[PDB]
Amino acid sequence: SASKAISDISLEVDRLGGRVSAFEMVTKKGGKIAEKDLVTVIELLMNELIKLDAIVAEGDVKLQRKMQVKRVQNYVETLDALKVKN
């Protein structure tokens, strides 16, 4: 069930996105993020990217898969930018 299996990865991406948001706030408020934590989250996101680089769908479901892929790419992009700065 494509649509379902993606909405599932989507739930994990929601949670990982929350961690990204937490890292951003810490940084915004003058705090420091452990490099170890940045790598942990980036790598959990890459695992979701791998899971989504294998879900076959058609029609609007294919669009949902690409949207989740875009979400992950954006978060990794945000995390890479933070790592430079942490």
Determine the size of the site formed for Cl ion (CB under 5 A): 2
Q: Tell the smallest beta-carbon distance from residue 66 to Cl ion (Å).
A: 7
Nearer to Cl ion, 44 or 57 (CB): 57
Interface region with Cl ion, contact rule CB under 5 A, candidates 6-14, 23-31, 37-45, 62-70: 62-70
In whole angstroms, give the CA distance from residue 60 to residue 66: 10
Determine how many CB atoms are found less than 10 A away from the CB of residue 65. Answer: 21
In whole angstroms, give the CA distance from residue 29 to residue 41: 20
The answer to the question of residue 51 lying near Cl ion (CB under 5 A) is no
Of 71, 70, 63, whose CA–CA distance to 3 is shortest?
A: 63
Binding site for Cl ion (CB under 5 A): 57, 62
